[PDB]
Amino acid sequence: CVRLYGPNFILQVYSSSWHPVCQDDWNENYGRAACRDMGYKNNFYSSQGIVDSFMKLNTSAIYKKLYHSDACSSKAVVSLRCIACGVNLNIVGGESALPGAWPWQVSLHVQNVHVCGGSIITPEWIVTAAHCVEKPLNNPWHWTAFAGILRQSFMFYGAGYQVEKVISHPNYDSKTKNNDIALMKLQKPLTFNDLVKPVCLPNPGMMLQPEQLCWISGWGATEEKGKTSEVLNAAKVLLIETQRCNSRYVYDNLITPAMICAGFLQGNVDSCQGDSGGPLVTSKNNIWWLIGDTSWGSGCAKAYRPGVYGNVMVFTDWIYRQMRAD
Template structure:
């Protein structure tokens, strides 16, 4: 824009503009000189377009450290690095040693059992099956079981390849606890060891050699054709199957009757989102047995389930949160179409407290054969008839097998 050089240049400041300071002015024509003298700007008000310089702070003045301080800092860092390196090396060495020990000392991974004489890995199903899979036959030397409804303690003889009952002569509770532990039971659940007269006559027994000294229980046992007391050992490793219900109660074949507390202390209600889905039975404080069809599909996740024990009425579950489930294991050969092998296990996150109203049921022992027309008891919160509503009160009924 052409302006008279004798006039001072005119600038517009759009930054700081206090009220009533500027005098309004008309736009200036490019070829006309302004009609008014330039306005007066107070000294505090800039009358130029400010330029914003880039701020650059002066670098801080670094005071030189004395040589001793530098040396100290350097030595501390060096020491820390050395300590950290040594710790990492030691951790790696310890981890490697543990892994080497684990794979060397436990060459049979998974559920296999190692033969002590040969190092051969043998499946648990091959132990005590009457066939020697270890070179020294140790897989058939420590075989013990509870047989029949009377829980008769029997020991397998690898020589004669037969099972024999243990004679009660010189037997005591300590031997009973050892036998239960060998079968995988927790010694804290041990119940009793007593002598009973067997229902069928035995011609051979396993007897204790009391003069054998303080050696392994099974090395004290030897085969004998006589048992002075005539009684064999009945061993109960858990306090299971004890109900206040009479063994032969008066009841109906169908329909059932309302139960009372302690009739069926192993009965539990398995629920999803507050609804009763299936029943189950306590077999240990941590484990529940139920049907595999109850936990198939989307219900196979333990997250959905709550287990209620020690209850009589379904309405009681409203006042408790139940027990959470940690793991569900269905029978590997369960068939959802035919319902073959329809059994599953639930492991609880927290063990149940065993009481008069919360107690395990007994699992069937080998030799327990159910005869035709034998009466059995069924308990649960089922319906009285097909398609009927679920009972609120626990029901027990007798049926014919």
Template sequence: EGTFKSYMKLNTSAGEVDLYKKLYSSDSCASGKVVSLRCIDCGLSTRSVNIMNRIVGGSGAVLGQWPWQVSLHVHGTHVCGGSIITRQWIVTAAHCVEGRFSDPYSWRAYAGILNQDEMLLRNGYRVQQIISHPDYDTDSKDNDIALMKLETPLTFSDTVRPVCLPNPGMMFQPNQQCWISGWGAEYQGGKTSNNLNYVMVPLIEQSRCNSIYIYNGMILPTMICAGHLEGGIDSCQGDSGGPLVTNKNSVWWLVGDTSWGTGCASPNRPGVYGNMTVFTDWIYKNMQVKY
């Protein structure tokens, strides 16, 4: 026998909740019985987001605004972003950790810091293990998700907190406002930004994103599109693996991880992200092994 640990965000002000109706079956637990429940605070930000001032071009973040955002370094250089989901686990993109970047001991994770120069003065958190999705496809970027397990747990604070993973079956609507953040280039071919930036991007319906004028059938069920079709706002090189989040009922949810796109902020070429609702079960199963 074994225990299966899963996580669900509940609104404590909702009163009595019928948990049974919210649970979903998994082949990890043949009996289907619930073993235990564990509480974890997630999706909390100490800073508000000024929507009206943050739409055009992206703006600099303030400490505590995106407390789940991490900078992932290889040999002292920022390579990708990631999202804190527990004290020891980070979600990033599989394409960040393929090939020569697959060695966990070459990585360091930095949390609760806005400025890349400041990170050079810190040791960061060593990575103990990398788990890349077994069905990740390098060419199509299908299943572009990976997990990093840190050697030592993070200490949570106002500036270091986990984001909430979406509950099974959670729906996100087209045009729903989401936010991306990262240290990526501020224009196509540019250098990594020294400061953490963020911007609002609306979700785009998959059928529209798959139209002949946009990505022409390249968007798979494991992907989700977000951005402004007129261009000018987007994620870019160096943002890969970082969070696409939305706010529902004052809680921040991880909608996706930054995956790919054609150019940066080009018209009719929005950003493409890993669809987190597809990956939650895979994440839980892999965390339970050594959580």
């Protein structure tokens, strides 16, 4: 019953609404304990008092040691970051990605060939699409991950990161593609550097614009019915309002609250076969956030047939629980 709220990572605790935690008597050790509860295990980044009813710490005997208070004597609330994420440098109709521009991007291989995309969230956890791991690719032995390499010809056999665990959302529906999200855990943790870094998981209360400016990246075909791209490509896309995406001329009521549309109704710029499982990201408060995972669409870059992505914000607490359960 502990969460991070908005682009400023305000620590909140639930009461049978949600209230922010006082900076009073708080320290890095309480922050570490809060991150462990969220399933971040050994990950911790920062804990600081932001000037934004409250939950106050009881200096007697992490969640059970908080009580409701009218005011914070420190006149600040806790801002909690569990991992250094969402920092980078500085597909149809896109452009070659630069080194370090999309450092959370991974290429997921089966039998030495790219199958799907993925997004690094921790040194051992990757977010992908549940449709990527449908039978007969449900078992983790099939899979290997490539990070910090832009080119498929530079992804050598024996050099990938073996996948040890595969977890599909319990409500994934293969007919409709509803709840199209899965997690992969690596056998060995990744080494973060200027080319390999995680993207931030989205917090409730991001307050994105109806047509928020986003980016997609992947090794998917550069034209409908085309082959896997040898190079990583990236493109700017705008969110498409669900009411508009659900209209008779677009996807006629097939867009659920677990899905987000992005792209252009005139087409020309879109995700395609092989981009699936990959990131849909946005920049807000100088942080890159994982808004979606490439899920589905009718054809590629066709007019009135945009891209459909898993609504990652809806899945964040399910993700936390799987990371904690491991």
